[PDB]
Amino acid sequence: DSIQAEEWYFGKITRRESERLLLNAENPRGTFLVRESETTKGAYSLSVSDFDNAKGLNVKHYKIRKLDSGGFYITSRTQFNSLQQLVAYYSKHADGLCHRLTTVCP
Amino acid sequence: AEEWYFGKITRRESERLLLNAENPRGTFLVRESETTKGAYSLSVSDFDNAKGLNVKHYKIRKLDSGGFYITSRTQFNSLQQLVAYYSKHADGLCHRLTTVCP
Structure with a gap:
């Protein structure tokens, strides 16, 4: 499925x-x-x-947990409808993570 | 840094x-x-x-002078030497430390 081929997903x-x-x-x-x-x-x-x-x-x-609605989260501050949206978000704001996400692992 | 250290x-x-x-x-x-x-x-x-x-x-205990041990038989000046030793000699462990957890 799509997730398998995301540049940032490593299965x-x-x-x-x-x-x-x-x-x-x-x-x-x-x-x-x-x-x-x-x-x-x-x-x-x-x-x-x-x-x-x-x-x-x-x-x-x-850890990223999946909610029964289908969303995902790392903290209580924000949840996301997809891993793509979680990655996009934490690319703009660390918001509790050690660092903003910058480079996608090669 | 060590591949067997899982923090x-x-x-x-x-x-x-x-x-x-x-x-x-x-x-x-x-x-x-x-x-x-x-x-x-x-x-x-x-x-x-x-x-x-x-x-x-x-348990791996740390000595005040810096080294480590699991038994009285041998002690090591670093934690990597411990691992390297027990990869070759079980000496009381259930098995030698042969495969690092993938």
């Missing part, structure tokens, strides 16, 4: 594999990718690269 | 992960201890006839 890659792709030093902070959650059925995960001078480059993982 | 995932999460594949015995990861500050926890899959596949958890 069933593991959290460890997403950190392997995201921790690459070429990536600016806020490089991200969406994937299925490995440990929660039916949820997704937004993994975001970030940096601090103590953990080094690191990745933060945010 | 703050939980005990339950590690068990979901370590058991969630066609993962052999001896698949493992290291994570921050939930129960004890400063320590880590080594989680390793195992198989036995009564339990079937199951996960064992081993």
